[PDB]
Design a protein around this nucleic acid. Structure first.
Length: 117
RNA sequence: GGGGGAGCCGAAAGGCGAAGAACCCA
């Protein structure tokens, strides 16, 4: 499995809420291609990876790429939820915050909580 | 092959689409 660690539900919800709000004043990449490219460019502040992705090889490269680029990533249950959170009309396998907008402190705390796992 | 990244089809109702719509480059 590409899921490297278990993420508590409340942290997932905090993450998705944060992503929704970041959409208002920041910049977000949505979809595996954009996300991957943003990561490769050194731009990702935080990446989201749905846990219910099939086939897994769609997002299976992400954890390790994020590690090489020193990018914190979090897992969320469903691509449906992620899609709603990034504000598109279809499911979404992975995403990234590129610019935290006004949520600098909230994002920082979130990534610390992630590292805490 | 490399980008772009939410539109596209349709009279409407609908449908498709980040598991990638227009569009750009080769």
């Amino acid at each position: 499995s590409y899921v490297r660690f278990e993420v508590p539900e409340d942290m997932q919800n905090e993450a998705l809420s944060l992503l929704e709000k970041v959409r208002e004043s920041g910049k977000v990449k949505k979809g595996t291609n954009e996300t991957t490219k943003a990561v490769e460019r050194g731009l990702a502040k935080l990446v989201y990876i749905a846990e219910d992705v099939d086939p897994p090889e769609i997002v299976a490269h992400l954890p390790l790429l994020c590690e090489e680029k020193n990018v914190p990533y979090i897992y969320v249950k469903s691509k449906n939820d992620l899609g709603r959170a990034v504000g598109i009309e279809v499911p979404c396998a992975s995403a990234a915050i590129i610019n935290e907008g006004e949520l600098r402190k909230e994002l920082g705390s979130l990534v610390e909580k992630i590292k805490g796992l």
